[PDB]
Design a binder for these strands. Sequence first.
DNA 1: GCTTACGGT
Length: 138
Amino acid sequence: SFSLLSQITPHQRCSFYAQVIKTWYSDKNFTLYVTDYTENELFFPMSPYTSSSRWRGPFGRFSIRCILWDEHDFYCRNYIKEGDYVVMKNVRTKIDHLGYLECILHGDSAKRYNMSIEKVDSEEPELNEIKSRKRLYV
DNA sequence: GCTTACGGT
């Protein structure tokens, strides 16, 4: 079952559709910042004032950081692009030191947890709520 | 795993 990002909670696995606002690969991991244009009280509040001008996403508590490790790194780092849509499945959630909720795709070569992330074609009807809610927001 | 809400690799 899928959840809107508004609905998800830390230390409970979740699946959701989202649009990618930001990517950044590093020597340690691959990070995404994603939104479905629903607000979560535990998300980081992005400032309209100090955010990078490149930030093509919403402000306030409307996006979430996703850390991708290992196999998830290697798969996505030169594949998932900013603006792309994704479905993420049975990902783990946790907080950072300041209490902000984020999600994590950790190593799992045994696939114990049935984790997956895959691109969704822009025209798929599954993305329609995201597109409308963006309207509402914009 | 994670100091970051940057960069453009």
